[model samples]
Target: FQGTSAEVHAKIKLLINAMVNIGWHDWEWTHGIGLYGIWQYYTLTNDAAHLDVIEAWFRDRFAAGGTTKNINTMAVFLTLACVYERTRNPAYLPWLDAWAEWAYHDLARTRRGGMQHVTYLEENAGQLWDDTLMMTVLPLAKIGVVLGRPHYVAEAKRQFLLHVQYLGDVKTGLFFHGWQFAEEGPGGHHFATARWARGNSWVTIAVPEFLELLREAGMADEALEEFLKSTLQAQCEALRPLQVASTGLWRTLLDVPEEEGSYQEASATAGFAFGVLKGQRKRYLGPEFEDMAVKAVKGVLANISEEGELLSMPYGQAMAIMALVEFARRFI
Candidate 1:
């Protein structure tokens, strides 16, 4: 199933067309990521048609303007800011500027100053989900760079530091899905402690994206860069053995026993492939890791249905509320 590079591109086009035709949420993380993926694809291929789709979505959404400004909603702005950065579209700048100010002045904070993982659905008071890194932090950093704001860059760096401090498991180099702050300062723990696959993939995607942001802004700190790179390496090391051997994909509850029935998922697989391949290209990962990325690419393409839905990919998962090993219950 290892298609040529052109074939791979064709499959992605099919998936994207299907995704757009089926419709996506206008202002949520789910479609935010959809926009982000399409943005990346358009950037790579220099395809004006895909770029047109991105511009059309944002133009319409901003005009209608019913977006709820939560962490998840902010995810859409990353690509929007990106669109503005490249195109210098004056219309998008005001929205980006206002959103960055809102993030800096009004976003909720948990104990020890982590960004509280608030979404449209729940307050998630004193809780931090791994999802926040890309959904909110990266957008602000990109906005920071484009807007010439040093504080935004610093805020993004601090958020990454705090999230890594609280969520990264040194024992396995994988991340827990959520961290809940206890009443006593620094007493918080990773609640549920489940290293769900898609959750981990956010970390996978964010690390490199964050590094690139810092680099672009001339804010890259050597130690912070090295530390985050090492953390990414560890997560990939942990992922190395977990990829399903036969299918070249991973299960929803990544490390959970296969017998538990957590199905092999596609989106997480694509995320990992993106991160690993990008990491290798950036020299953050060794050459051997390319195999893992290649495997993931073919595996992901294999899961695309004729209609373009990625088979086995789960719908949105809220915070997990159990032990790491207990994640199988989620799939059941």
Candidate 2:
């Protein structure tokens, strides 16, 4: 543990510096992950520069945009809402509200209440990607807490629970990447059962944030809290066995490491590490998992470049830094 705190602090600063220098774009959820990290980092340090970066990014992205037609395109508003909560800037609220309105009212949903993956095709309209949950639910839940609108949080929970009912694997206690419904009503034929690493990580990432919002709303029902606790615990348990023993990372296709074209993926690992640490810190998980979280962070640290890039991916590195920050918060 010698100099571990200094190493983590230096790595985090290096990450934020590299990210800010690279600049921000509203290219969707991959980019949103770093923005989410900025929010978390700001919470820890009370650094308004983090907010400035986000606000600047928002200003630039909207300036060149016409309108976003896809629900996934609106994920950046989650970060926007995060900044708005801290600053309470009226300018940010309108943009945040507009996106939330679309997400809640107009975004296409399956008959069973899962948001459609895209708007390009009617046949695939009922399809839901596990990647969609964090982008949609985190913002909705955060907005609910910010605006005192319990309905937003309720809708988020509803969408997530319904989607999981269709996509969650019973045996593995994990989620598949995408689900396609044949019909509009119900009992649609199943499609896309591949257990994807990042897809499962998205659930692990969002649940704790949703629980925090639930607490803020004073709607922290014991049943719901317990459900989230168990959900995260089960996910960590399922994922622990899948981790690559050599790298302490997970493969792109979570359950199949030896498959052709599969490799250890950094973003999913970082996201899971961050999620697991968040759970442990929140007491949603037991102390036994603390060692796992520590190992996960170490794995990420080992993969990072000297310049602070993780697998040469900015989003993954941001998540790794977030994990390190959370770990330090709990144990340092």
Candidate 3:
């Protein structure tokens, strides 16, 4: 982790390929995140091979076309938007255009337009979960930029505010896992109100990604940037004390104590590292937080096995706040 940026990039490439070589599955949302990682690698390294790999992945997926149109499955297209931005390949346009249109006009919404957190199995009606931002909203915005549809961007902007309105916790500066509109939650508040580690990681990464995407498209809403900047920093500031320095990771339920049986989690740790590093480089987060991000990635790097199956990260895990609530509720 202390290596030069060049050295770190080499290590990152190793990790990406290790997972990339695993090939495809129905892990669409996870696949979506993996594609974004590959895109970041492509952008930083400016290598076409990364592009080739992901392009092939998309080509294969697009042809088969069996995935649901829910929020999580939409994550795969976020990178596709980025790819189209770079390549301007017309072949990608049909898929991009259709998905973006679906996002703006057809994708389900909760009360007041918060994107519902639907996955393969559930519709999750009238609910707003933190996971939706990374999975759907970012792609919707970026696709707007690529397609020159300002309306799409506008809807995406509204979603950001809406999610903040519902999920943002003013007192703690951290967000809960979800907010249910139809059913009463615990204490009649948000469901599973654990500031679950992987859940918040999406916001950490997505907010930065959102801002950068806007800047890239030369679309700036001062209020959007202003509001999200503070939200992201607040979460970062709150997360500092929770870092388990020995393990170089955050807990599964971020607010829970390690001794209370919360375990170190890899996915969220890597996510925080990505956001913290990018936030510092972009000056979205101050330089003081750099050490924490580095510690996180170093810890995440350790979790990888020799053959590159990610360890300490859950398998088939959905950041739904379902089981996490049981494990984390007592602490919160």
Candidate 4:
């Protein structure tokens, strides 16, 4: 019983037509997710009418000229692959399989380990964190196992080790934000200042996911379990003091909230709540962790607009990140 079926169907038809006329967003992940989101919604609704149009749109466009630009693009590939599984459409294969090949041989590979980012450095690339490896590798590995390709495990190990080797901090027992290869102040400007709070958020969320994937694959051992526990504990410690107000929702800026650029944001807080609740369920955090998780969720819900929209990333921090710089700003 969809409450908004008429309006929803109207919007879906409009989007399907719009996609055919103007096409989907771009050849990248952000735009890719837009398409994926549509397919996922349609799949859930069992709306076959819209699916055909969207599928045709993807196939026709890729046959013309489209590519997987970066690691984020790889994410797009997986999302479409999900659509393919539901519909048995060949259109998904061309994009997903093509992206997978590029990921393994070109974008993700390196002599030491997996790439910091997903493309050639000459592509004016930005290397955020190898935790992206966590995002791509496990998914690819699962796919590989299903497809009977053992090299996926090798790739994950190499990439994971590289992530730990370079970005990991022994003192705090947590991974740093990311390293950028630029000239700003001291050594280089890849990451100019302090540890990025969001970067930590990435690892905190990733380790548990990685562990779950490995465990389901029957590969989780004593070592992997300990690693997951330690990483999660370290992250919880680092974030404990950053919790704003009586609620446990952490600010967007974890390390230093009073800096020139800082804000209490929703997505990151949601992410943190997810991680803490997960940890509490695993018994990694004590009973108090449940309260923390619940409080964070409560705070985020309270902060949402009366119309149910979450607020934008806070002012100063959003400005620093140039939230709308790389992309257009559109409110939902």
Candidate 5:
């Protein structure tokens, strides 16, 4: 009730156990988040059953060839790598290698070097977006760590830098949803200029995770870490001013808070809260931001339903749970 470590930990355990009663069997992009948080719980609680659950989920997907070609499917590679690291299951290697190959060798890229979210069987046209960081970059970067492939890490850094260059805004330290440059023509076009908070949140949240992965793998890159820290600080500063005065939440459209069809967004707020807390704890941000991170998590905790659903949005709920768990792990 007080949002302490014991309370939040017990609450999340209850939520996961409740979901297990119904058999958590979906192997989709959304469930990637579910498994991600579940794996984090295993690390936090050392629940062997949690590892079993993740391994079973991934085994089913691997047997079914369920995750490939689509960028979203690649998100689960991190979970695969986690289990592989724990169990050293040779069975997990092929799928992991396949996905990594697809991500690094097979995926198409825009002329500007940003990875395009496209599949050969599907339409071969898609531009890079801020949200793509989680879909492809995170897993690729993690795989780089898992395999000790500095080139993979370097490529991940390059892709992110390109996206930042095109989409990131200097004045606000936020990013547009997507950017499209006109080739051999006029100029360029920026889509969804409203700095959708969710997309920006993904970029901010991911940088620290990426940095942590690199550090854990003993492949930490000083320049990359410094760049990510600066970027994370800028985003935190930009988002601090936009937090809703009354509720401590952010709007779906960050810059246009008063626009029609706009309201408090749980997912983006959780994403930012997680980024802020994890960044400070990881020393990516200074202690000055720690109190702000605490405030954000407290506000998010106030919004969770008795049923464990965060603002009644699945992605938001998953991310909010992750934020809470990360907070507990640090300062609880």
Candidate 6:
């Protein structure tokens, strides 16, 4: 449970309402997860006061039972699953159907694809961020397992193979931050050195968490289990090199060593902390990981201003983008 539940709920409700009204594109990979995460807590708590607006939006705007402006992504299934729990809502079943159908259609069309950054219809869209692989598949796979659709799980595995083929770096034992829509040369450079450390954080940490979910949901395959474990092992080390000397916070840009511009980003640090703690909890990571998470959390808490300002780790302005997003995304 969150430490600041009431405050978090209030802020989350406001932000979800705001995003739903203003956000234009239906690119679920980026936009949907925030809402889905909120929906999770809202459902579990039976907080209809918070969900009432979202429920109305679903009825009024997404009348067809899918996202309005964006192509369906994992967020679709994630949010719908929450709705199912809240309402025991049979209407959300069609929402799951729509996600499965879209996956089928898009996967058929875009097995070989490339782009600068992935939006949606990804194989056809071509942008290859390592994060896309997990974000794209996990929510749908969650829905599939609950609903008895192995096809969704199969599609997730297939995309994951493409993720490894394109971004897996042997030396680093981690996926590169970003990839082009097209495949690179044998000695290919990953296009974006601009590591949104949070992006890699999401993949390394969030992706494996879902893999465990798939396992427990009885959807595990030997290949996926291996992929996730191997990836986690490497990623944990990759993160270790980025840890701040005194604070234990991961620098916002993991590879940018000793650069003044590199700040300690709360979102990335939180992600790393969450990953390590969760991994330890799952026994995927060792006790050392637990210690690292605790240290990071304490350092992070000290950085949070009582006046509601967030001090990013590694000493950026308190209101750094990662800190704000993490506070909003997680606190809420």
Give the alpha carbon lDDT tens digit for every residue of 88-114 in model 4: 665465555666666677673433444
Candidate 1 lDDT, 4-108, residue by residue in tens? 555556666766776676635345567767777777777666889989988888878878875878998898888888888889989887899898998878999
Top candidate when judged by lDDT against the true structure: 1
The alpha-carbon lDDT assigned to residue 227 of candidate 5 equals: 84
The TM-score between candidate 3 and the true structure equals: 0.89
Candidate scoring better on lDDT of 1 and 2: 1
lDDT of 3 by residue, 6-70 (tens): 54455555666666665364456677777777677676557888889888887777778746688
Which model, 2 or 3, shows the larger TM-score? 2
Off by over 4 Å in 1: 184-186, 312-332
Question: lDDT for model 6, on a 0 to 1 scale?
Answer: 0.56
Worst 10 residues of 4 by lDDT: 323-332
Per-prediction TM-score, please?
Answer: 0.91, 0.91, 0.89, 0.67, 0.91, 0.72
Report the C-alpha lDDT of model 2 over 124-212, residue by residue, as the tens digit: 66778776777676777777778777788888888768766777776788877777777545466555565678778888888787777
List pairs with backbone clashes in candidate 4: 180-190, 182-189
Q: Write the per-residue lDDT of candidate 5 for residues 78-164, one digit (tens) a residue.
A: 777776777788887777778888889888877667787663255335466786787778888877766667788888888878887
- Model 1 lDDT on a 0 to 1 scale: 0.76
Sort by lDDT, top down from the best? 1, 5, 2, 3, 6, 4
Off by over 4 Å in 2: 65-69, 119-123
Q: After superposition, how far is residue 16 of candidate 5 from its true place, in Å?
A: 3.0
Clash count (model 2, backbone only): 0
The C-alpha lDDT values of all candidates are 0.76, 0.75, 0.74, 0.52, 0.75, 0.56
Clashing pairs in 6: 26-70, 114-126, 114-181, 114-182, 115-126, 115-127, 115-181, 126-181, 264-313
